[PDB]
Design an enzyme around this catalytic site. Sequence first.
Site, PDB file in Angstrom:
ATOM      1  CE  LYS A 196       4.156  44.802  55.469  1.00 31.87           C
ATOM      2  NZ  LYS A 196       5.020  43.775  54.830  1.00 31.87           N
TER       3      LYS A 196
ATOM      4  CD  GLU B 266       8.629  38.674  63.661  1.00 31.65           C
ATOM      5  OE1 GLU B 266       8.081  39.507  64.409  1.00 31.65           O
ATOM      6  OE2 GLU B 266       9.265  38.995  62.635  1.00 31.65           O
ATOM      7  NE  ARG B 267      13.826  40.580  59.473  1.00 34.72           N
ATOM      8  CZ  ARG B 267      13.739  40.710  58.161  1.00 34.72           C
ATOM      9  NH1 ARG B 267      14.827  40.643  57.421  1.00 34.72           N
ATOM     10  NH2 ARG B 267      12.603  41.103  57.614  1.00 34.72           N
TER      11      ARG B 267
HETATM   12  N1  LIG Z   1      -2.089  57.479  61.774  1.00 33.77           N
HETATM   13  C1  LIG Z   1      -0.797  57.867  61.674  1.00 33.77           C
HETATM   14  N2  LIG Z   1      -0.418  59.120  61.982  1.00 33.77           N
HETATM   15  C2  LIG Z   1       0.864  59.509  61.886  1.00 33.77           C
HETATM   16  N3  LIG Z   1       1.860  58.706  61.483  1.00 33.77           N
HETATM   17  C3  LIG Z   1       1.616  57.425  61.137  1.00 33.77           C
HETATM   18  C4  LIG Z   1       0.243  56.929  61.223  1.00 33.77           C
HETATM   19  N4  LIG Z   1       0.262  55.647  60.841  1.00 33.77           N
HETATM   20  C5  LIG Z   1       1.542  55.340  60.538  1.00 33.77           C
HETATM   21  N5  LIG Z   1       2.350  56.392  60.729  1.00 33.77           N
HETATM   22  C6  LIG Z   1       3.801  56.395  60.470  1.00 33.77           C
HETATM   23  O1  LIG Z   1       4.326  55.078  60.396  1.00 33.77           O
HETATM   24  C7  LIG Z   1       5.743  55.213  60.522  1.00 33.77           C
HETATM   25  C8  LIG Z   1       6.385  53.898  60.947  1.00 33.77           C
HETATM   26  O2  LIG Z   1       5.934  52.785  60.185  1.00 33.77           O
HETATM   27  P1  LIG Z   1       5.910  51.331  60.868  1.00 33.77           P
HETATM   28  O3  LIG Z   1       4.544  50.712  60.764  1.00 33.77           O
HETATM   29  O4  LIG Z   1       6.557  51.435  62.221  1.00 33.77           O
HETATM   30  O5  LIG Z   1       6.921  50.580  59.870  1.00 33.77           O
HETATM   31  P2  LIG Z   1       7.198  49.007  59.940  1.00 33.77           P
HETATM   32  O6  LIG Z   1       6.709  48.497  58.612  1.00 33.77           O
HETATM   33  O7  LIG Z   1       8.687  48.917  60.129  1.00 33.77           O
HETATM   34  O8  LIG Z   1       6.396  48.556  61.129  1.00 33.77           O
HETATM   35  C9  LIG Z   1       5.942  56.346  61.509  1.00 33.77           C
HETATM   36  O9  LIG Z   1       6.848  57.296  60.954  1.00 33.77           O
HETATM   37  C10 LIG Z   1       4.572  56.970  61.641  1.00 33.77           C
HETATM   38  O10 LIG Z   1       4.674  58.386  61.505  1.00 33.77           O
END
Ligand SMILES: Nc1ncnc2c1ncn2[C@@H]1O[C@H](COP(=O)(O)OP(=O)(O)O)[C@@H](O)[C@H]1O
Lengths: 458, 118, 460, 85, 85, 55
Positions: C156, C182-183
């Site tokens: 996200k 937010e947190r």
């Molecule tokens: N284009 C991408 N290539 C590789 N991994 C991705 C890509 N987009 C998202 N990810 C994955 O998103 C994961 C983390 O999700 P994140 O957006 O940080 O979660 P949150 O909802 O907590 O923000 C990571 O493990 C990452 O590998």
Amino acid sequence: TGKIVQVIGAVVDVEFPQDAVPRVYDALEVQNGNERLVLEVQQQLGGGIVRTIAMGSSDGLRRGLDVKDLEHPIEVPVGKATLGRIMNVLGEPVDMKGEIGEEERWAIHRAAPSYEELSNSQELLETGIKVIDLMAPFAKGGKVGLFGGAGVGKTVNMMELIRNIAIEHSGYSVFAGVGERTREGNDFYHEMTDSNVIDKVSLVYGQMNEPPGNRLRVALTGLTMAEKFRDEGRDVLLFVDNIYRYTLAGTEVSALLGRMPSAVGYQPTLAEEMGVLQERITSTKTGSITSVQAVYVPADDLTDPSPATTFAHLDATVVLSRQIASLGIYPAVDPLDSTSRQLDPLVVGQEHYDTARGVQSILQRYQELKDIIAILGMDELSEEDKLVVARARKIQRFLSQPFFVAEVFTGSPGKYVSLKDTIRGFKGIMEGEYDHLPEQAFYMVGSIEEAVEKAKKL
Amino acid sequence: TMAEKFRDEGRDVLLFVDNIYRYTLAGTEVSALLGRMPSAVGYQPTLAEEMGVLQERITSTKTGSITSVQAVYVPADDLTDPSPATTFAHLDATVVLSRQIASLGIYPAVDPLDSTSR
Amino acid sequence: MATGKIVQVIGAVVDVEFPQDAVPRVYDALEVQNGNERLVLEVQQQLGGGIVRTIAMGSSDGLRRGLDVKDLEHPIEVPVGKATLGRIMNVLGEPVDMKGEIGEEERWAIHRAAPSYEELSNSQELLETGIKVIDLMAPFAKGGKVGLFGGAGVGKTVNMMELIRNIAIEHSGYSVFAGVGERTREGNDFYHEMTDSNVIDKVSLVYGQMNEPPGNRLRVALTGLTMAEKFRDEGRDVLLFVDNIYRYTLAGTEVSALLGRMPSAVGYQPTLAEEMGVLQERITSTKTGSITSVQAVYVPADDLTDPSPATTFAHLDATVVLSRQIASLGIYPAVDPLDSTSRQLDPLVVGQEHYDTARGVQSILQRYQELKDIIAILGMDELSEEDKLVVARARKIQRFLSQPFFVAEVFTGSPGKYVSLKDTIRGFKGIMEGEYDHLPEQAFYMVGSIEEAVEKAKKL
Amino acid sequence: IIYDDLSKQAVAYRQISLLLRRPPGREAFPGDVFYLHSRLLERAARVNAEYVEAFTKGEVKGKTGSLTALPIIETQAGDVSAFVP
Amino acid sequence: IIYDDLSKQAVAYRQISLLLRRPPGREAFPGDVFYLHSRLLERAARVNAEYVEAFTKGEVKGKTGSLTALPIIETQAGDVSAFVP
Amino acid sequence: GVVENLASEQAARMVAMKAATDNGGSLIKELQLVYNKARQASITQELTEIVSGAA
Ligand SMILES: Nc1ncnc2c1ncn2[C@@H]1O[C@H](COP(=O)(O)OP(=O)(O)O)[C@@H](O)[C@H]1O
Ligand SMILES: Nc1ncnc2c1ncn2[C@@H]1O[C@H](COP(=O)(O)OP(=O)(O)OP(=O)(O)O)[C@@H](O)[C@H]1O
Ligand SMILES: [Mg+2]
């Protein structure tokens, strides 16, 4: 003599000199621009203030207007002078004809007949309608209620009962329009005039168009005419276009009258307000009233206070189901909920009573199987359970009927069915005399002969 | 107060209470007239305070012990309801009698999957 | 000169008496010394007799009766423009980072009328995001509201950083991020990840933490929206991120309950539908420029009929669903192409080529999800030579939805790609017409546009 | 005449009514909510030529006036059985 | 830190609020019942070395500090959608 | 003939079990819509009793 001191929606407070304060339910009068407005007194507050409901639109009222105290309640014309004419809550003529040739006017607020006056009767009244006089037959001089949600058939059913009962009956009739559609008042008036039956019918209309105060009182205007014809010693038919609107117009004003809310926000007085109306609609040793009432059921909730209170008032109750109506089975009567005081072996006799309880038992057992059938399907049932279903489905179809007033919708010609044909018909289905016909053979056929002729062409 | 007198003598006593629910329900009746605004399913706002002040006297001290058995009405068998739900925390053994079992006539009707003890 | 005095303090609700000829208008901001810091109060009601009723924009503890009150004659006013970019502020527009004063040029009042009927644009135009799944299957309008429905683990926030980056670089816009409740931990994480990505200069951040009194958490959305209305006037097209539109709704419920208005169905405020409209109608395309918004949505019981969802859904143009099941395939962005929707996806808006392509992909991926049942229940032997062809194409369609993000390069180790709307249509239309049928299915994964899939297949 | 979302007119009137402290009924709508919609629609009608002649002061004769209405309502989850529907 | 029965803290604060005649919200909890738990739980934090250095006036330099909170909530029938939960 | 009937039974069972799974799914969506009404009503009903009790 009085002064207006508040105006809150439909409610108007008036101050009078403390030696002169109007009684409860007195009529007051005030000039509102270029028209006269009546107010009816509801409560005496302290200090010569009196709280009243406007019998008309309250817009354009100022504070400080002079109010005239009429010494009497709302009084309406009664007797044969009203026959054939359309009248307002105030007893004014609303057709374009001249004044009403009254000889007498009666106050719309009255006490019910005493316990000594009431009369019993067991004369079964026949109807054209297979399900009604099979499942919930009713007597001359009794009360019938049609309960249902929005758009289920309350009016069409009442129009068949008018067609069937009120034209083989010979006496006078009163139709009270209470908070219903104006179009349907006009449509009714004409066909009465086109049929030249109008001269036996008095009509009072207080449709949804009108301000609260009109919808509240107009039911009492209708009863007061019917009570004149009853006390004259006649047998009278009273039709009430929607009794629910009387209670609802009470709900709308009750908060402005300063009464704490009850239950689902209803007025605290709901059962007394309904009871004091309902107890007047009774046949008596002097003369009889036969009554049919439509009862709107809000949100289809039959456990709502306003339906729930009405059920104890009535002798026969016919309950209309949206779930059946969306099958297109009409009339959409639920036979497992419809009931009558007259379904008793002594008055109906045993063949009718046994046929009705058989139909009730098969259709109940079909409800018990429907939850099995929904998940498993029918193939899992026992071979007797499959026969119960195969009969119940034919029974549900054979309760359907073409109505003469409904011809404009289905095109198909209407049917009038004698009681003997209904009993013979359902008794044959439950005995299995017809187990070889398809279900489609039974849908919308007047009599069991007509099912077998339909079956030949499927 | 009678049971506390015998406890303070140093005796060991049994206390039976025929329904604790009806102590709470009697508070609800007066509470509206005592001018308190209402809370939850009509219960007085003080429900947990009133329950705790009573239940916390029924204990066994170093001088003497009170053993008690209390019946608890459960409105419509809804163990969610604030009055039974609050008292569950004050007990040590709780036996739950269920209409679902009682419908089968199999008394004592104790539910083993809900009854428990410390 | 202070002219009011405090006359009641009941939690967050503070009543102040003014001289009768001086009563603050509604939404005017007051201030008082709460010992050794100034506390702002926002006016909610004018009561009779010079008494006004206010919500404290800070801690109410330590207020006495009889304290002097200064009537600032404006609403809450916040700094706007380029000086805000890369800075964190509270609802009052005060810096919450340590990074000194904001070099403001203007301060705008946060309470505004929406654009009038004559100011609204006379066109409907897509905002090209550069992201294949979104641009094909869930196209954004300029001036659109977009719902994000995914949970956690689903990518996200990385999706948010990619949108921020492309609108700043491939367009010439800016972003505002409004942290509605937010947190504080997650606000710190997100700020560092935007620094590590180098998108922080591109976006301005207004954060309302949960620890804040309800008035702060309600109004913080309007501060962020006001900074976006500045950028728009400059003539830019702007992104506004709302980090939970549900918490804006609940903050209105809390404030109106503290004010003691009569509650409504399911206990929400009676003003619920107007408070949503007051926010959402400012986010539109104007002849000068547009604000487009991406809003995180939460469904109070997974009940879609509950008033908060039901009111919010009336304002959304597009819905984007992120699923962990797709993230299990290693497909990123993890966007479900069958549950994501966009009302813009109509022939009269996107045109027939786009419409037929997206309907094609939808119908093929729907059919593949049926044949996956047969392949499981009966196996691949059951499957016809036409049904094997739709399976073989759906796997290629499914992978060609993947795309490498410029902000994800530290995960993938491959340079990001931006794909134009014409190229993504041409690619999926290609595969559906059965040219490119002969390439390996791994030639499509993470590649970019179709012109790069034929380069990948030449060496794979 | 088309009225778009008489469901939103009811929500607006409920806001005004609750801010005026009026006791709510089923759901949270005031008891007045039927009278709100009914007085609006019941104006839609066809009127006989005698009414048109009386209203116009005889300037128009023998013509029947009309006003058709198409109100729009929105149901949650296709539930036809809710109060306002 | 372990807070046992934060649902009991919310019941205590409801009692205080209703006796002080402050307007009720859903399930009779006061309007600021979210603000009660949120400002409590947001204090559980890990803080960086420069905060600890500033707070202690430099007598502690290299260390972060933390407070970890395990609140407890009791659901009534697995109804996680009750207000306080 | 026995063996080809046994192939027919296991096939007829799968077809019928497939329908049940679908019919069960319909029953779940219906029932959940009923519950979400019952939930919302019970919240609104009791909150009116509380607010009207501040008198
Ligand atoms: N284009 C991408 N290539 C590789 N991994 C991705 C890509 N987009 C998202 N990810 C994955 O998103 C994961 C983390 O999700 P994140 O957006 O940080 O979660 P949150 O909802 O907590 O923000 C990571 O493990 C990452 O590998
Ligand atoms: N016996 C019938 N045969 C065919 N159609 C019917 C029958 N009964 C009802 N209907 C259909 O239902 C419609 C509404 O019936 P009716 O006007 O009696 O409903 P109602 O219960 O009076 O509704 P409301 O509460 O709105 O007045 C009819 O116009 C017709 O379309
Ligand atoms: Mg009707």
